[PDB]
Amino acid sequence: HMFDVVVIGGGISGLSAAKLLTEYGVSVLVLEARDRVGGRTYTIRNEHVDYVDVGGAYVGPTQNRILRLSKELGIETYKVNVSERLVQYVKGKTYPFRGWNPIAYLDYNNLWRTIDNMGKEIPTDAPWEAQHADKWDKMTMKELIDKICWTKTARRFAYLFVNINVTSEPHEVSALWFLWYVKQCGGTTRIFSVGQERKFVGGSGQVSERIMDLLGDQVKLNHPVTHVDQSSDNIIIETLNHEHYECKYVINAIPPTLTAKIHFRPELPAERNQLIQRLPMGAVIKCMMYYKEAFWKKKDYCGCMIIEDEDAPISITLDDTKPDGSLPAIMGFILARKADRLAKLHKEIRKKKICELYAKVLGSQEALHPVHYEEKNWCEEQYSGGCYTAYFPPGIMTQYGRVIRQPVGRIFFAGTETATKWSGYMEGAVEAGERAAREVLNGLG
Ligand SMILES: *[C]C1=C([C])[C]=[C@@]23C(=[C]1)N([C][C]([O])[C]([O])[C]([O])[C]OP([O])(=O)OP([O])(=O)O[C][C]1O[C](N4[C]=NC5=C4N=[C]N=C5[N])[C]([O])[C]1[O])C1=NC(=O)[N]C(=O)C1=N2C3#C[C]N([C])[C][C][C]OC1=[C][C]=C(Cl)[C]=C1Cl
């Protein structure tokens, strides 16, 4: 019942906070809505797959927080095999290699150059302060692309870059925000690696699980927080089943839209009440297709494909075979408006649709005979809102966004949507948690 801090939510962010706080001898309790920790990271384990991340999986270099943490937790990593030739799919046929129009590629990298130069103006700690904030916030990321790119290849190809990175549609997202977003990953280069990718040996879900190991029964599953009352020195916290917990500080560690569902006494300041209200989550279905053999490797196909076809389920693919070569698999995201559209469908109908995409992208009959299939659809995510992260619609960043990680009395704000480096990724979840934890620490001693 009685603790120094309560952490709302036990994804990587809430758990990171909790662990640091624990390192300093602070009494922490974690209330977590689900019957598992890990949130948007989730490793399904079953005899068909051994294990598989249906959520966040990939960590890059430069991402030292989650690397240091996982390493401490005793979790190894492995290099995602980007073995052979990448395949792009455009306008029916398919092309193997780099990106093939001159003037259009001169357009290509000019766009990524511009996006970065534009990045320079935007303070990562406060994008709302950018000299050109207003112009850029009013502006949709689609019009920006159009205003910059002279050709429709670049333009089209860019839309899909936006799709892949923020699971959303260009017309729906603030230019300011997107430009910030990329910048805060180290810019165009880093974010989307032409490209040392890694996954955790055994699942990214381990990061959370192992911290729950450290915390024991101070992590409470099936405890969705519904009220936070702050009005009297001791903070009373209520969960769905009308259990009560009291503590001296709170750390909100759940995404904006979800924070909005909690009842706050006193109310959150009007400004913030609006912000958290207006950042929608993105939309993805993550899909692992399993095959008896790694047939794509055999045709010198990497197994990673960038698909920019109108009516094709999957938009981007990666090989996902185990580090030793057992249980060959192809991981694909079906995302943004495609996710919304195909979410309706039965799992089995997606599986067939997907298989025949692969058949004709890979020109192989064996793509039609999967051995097993796993997917989580994150749109339909009650305790997540969606993946990978929250986006900013136009004008929102500057109307309310300033207040994005500011305390209210004794309530502090974590969650990857509040990081200033790799916001939206597992890395960002850590940065957030830890930052929030330290904030609480200063509010002590
Ligand atoms: C879902 C997802 C997917 C599908 C995918 C992915 C992802 C995801 N991602 C993202 C991540 O995951 C995120 O960011 C994170 O995780 C976040 O975290 P946090 O902050 O913590 O949050 P969460 O998890 O959610 O947690 C929370 C918690 O809480 C709870 N709750 C709620 N409510 C409540 C509660 N409690 C109490 N009470 C109440 N009230 C919940 O339940 C939870 O638990 C990712 N990430 C990373 O990092 N990585 C990755 O991968 C990922 N994934 C995405 C995608 C990405 N991309 C694409 C990029 C990368 C790259 O890729 C590539 C490259 C190259 C080529 Cl060629 C290809 C490709 Cl694909």
Swiss-Prot record:
Cofactor(s) needed: FAD
Positions on the Cytoplasmic side per record topology: 1-445
Localization per record: Mitochondrion outer membrane
Marked site (Important for substrate specificity) residue numbers: I316
Tissue: Heart, liver, duodenum, blood vessels and kidney.
Keywords: Acetylation, Catecholamine metabolism, Disease variant, FAD, Flavoprotein, Intellectual disability, Membrane, Mitochondrion, Mitochondrion outer membrane, Neurotransmitter degradation, Oxidoreductase, Phosphoprotein, Transmembrane, Transmembrane helix
Top-rank taxon, per record: Eukaryota
Effect ascribed to mutating C304S: No loss of activity
GO molecular function, one term: monoamine oxidase activity
Residues recorded with modification Phosphoserine: S364
Bilayer topology term: Single-pass type IV membrane protein
GO biological process: biogenic amine metabolic process; dopamine catabolic process; positive regulation of signal transduction
Enzyme Commission code(s) on record: 1.4.3.21, 1.4.3.4
Stated name of the protein: Amine oxidase [flavin-containing] A
Organism: Homo sapiens
Gene it is expressed from: MAOA
